[PDB]
Amino acid sequence: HHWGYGKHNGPEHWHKDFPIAKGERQSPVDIDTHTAKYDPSLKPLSVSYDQATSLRILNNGHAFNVEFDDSQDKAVLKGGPLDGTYRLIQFHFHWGSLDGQGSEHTVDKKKYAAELHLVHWNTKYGDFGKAVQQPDGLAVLGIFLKVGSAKPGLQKVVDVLDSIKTKGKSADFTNFDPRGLLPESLDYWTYPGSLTTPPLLECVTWIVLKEPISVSSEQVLKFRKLNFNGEGEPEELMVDNWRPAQPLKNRQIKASFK
Numbered sequence: 001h002h003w004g005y006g007k008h009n010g011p012e013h014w015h016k017d018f019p020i021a022k023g024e025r026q027s028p029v030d031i032d033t034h035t036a037k038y039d040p041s042l043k044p045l046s047v048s049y050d051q052a053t054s055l056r057i058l059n060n061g062h063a064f065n066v067e068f069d070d071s072q073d074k075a076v077l078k079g080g081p082l083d084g085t086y087r088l089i090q091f092h093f094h095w096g097s098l099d100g101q102g103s104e105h106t107v108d109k110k111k112y113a114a115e116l117h118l119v120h121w122n123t124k125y126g127d128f129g130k131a132v133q134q135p136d137g138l139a140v141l142g143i144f145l146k147v148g149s150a151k152p153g154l155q156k157v158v159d160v161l162d163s164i165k166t167k168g169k170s171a172d173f174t175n176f177d178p179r180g181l182l183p184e185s186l187d188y189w190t191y192p193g194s195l196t197t198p199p200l201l202e203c204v205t206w207i208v209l210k211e212p213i214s215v216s217s218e219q220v221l222k223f224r225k226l227n228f229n230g231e232g233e234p235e236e237l238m239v240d241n242w243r244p245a246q247p248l249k250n251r252q253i254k255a256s257f258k
């Protein structure tokens with residue numbers, strides 16, 4: 001018995017093994033656009049992904065991760081509300097069984113079809129495992145996906161999913177350029193939060209972009225063909241691997257735009 005998104009082990013049960021689930025800075029949250037405070041102190045984001053080196057794609061039983069070499073400052077995030085340099089380590093998505101759900105964050109209670117998370121860690125802490133123990137250890141860039149026109153930069157990912165259908169499977173995935181997944185504008189909202197899967201540690205500066213990217217129905221359909229289970233196990237489709245919104249408590253969401 002282990003955590004998941006099922007009836008018997010989903011997000012409402014997580015607190016029994018991970019009591020920080022009922023914490024003061026949990027994620028995701030609903031972004032109320034009218035109560036978000038514009039902050040003119042906030043800088044533009046600096047996304048430097050020209051030298052990224054992707055290595056692998058892995059089905060870990062709850063999503064698929066694209067992993068990067070983070071042994072050097074190749075692909076880094078700076079600026080915005082951040083102090084210091086954060087290295088990209090992996091990205092993954094959360095998605096729904098239907099196009100009207102699947103994102104983790106919501107915007108004025110609107111749900112999107114999926115949410116992309118680009119996970120970065122603060123190089124001051126030397127390794128990812130140390131960074132997750134620090135209140136400023138991680139910076140996660142969140143991008144919403146809406147269904148419409150296809151996203152060409154996503155297709156290389158969609159085409160390899162058949163090779164990692166079940167939990168524990170991995171495939172080589174080199175020379176993938178994550179710049180192809182970014183929207184045109186880098187205007188964002190930011191708040192202090194947590195990992196959205198166990199262990200739910202409260203180490204994340206969330207940076208959620210205002211502008212969604214569009215993907216085709218056929219692309220997201222391919223996500224829903226993945227399996228939570230391992231090969232040879234009873235087939236459970238990997239859908240609805242999103243955590244619902246958590247209370248904001250004593251936090252303020254800031255906007256970099258008005």
Ligand SMILES: CCOc1ccc2nc(S(N)(=O)=O)sc2c1
Binds near residue numbers: 198200
């Ligand atoms: C410490 C084991 O690695 C983890 C565990 C949970 C986790 N959640 C996220 S998310 N959904 O981007 O907030 S990235 C991440 C990395």
Ligand SMILES: [Zn+2]
Binds near residue numbers: 092093094196
């Ligand atoms: Zn995530």
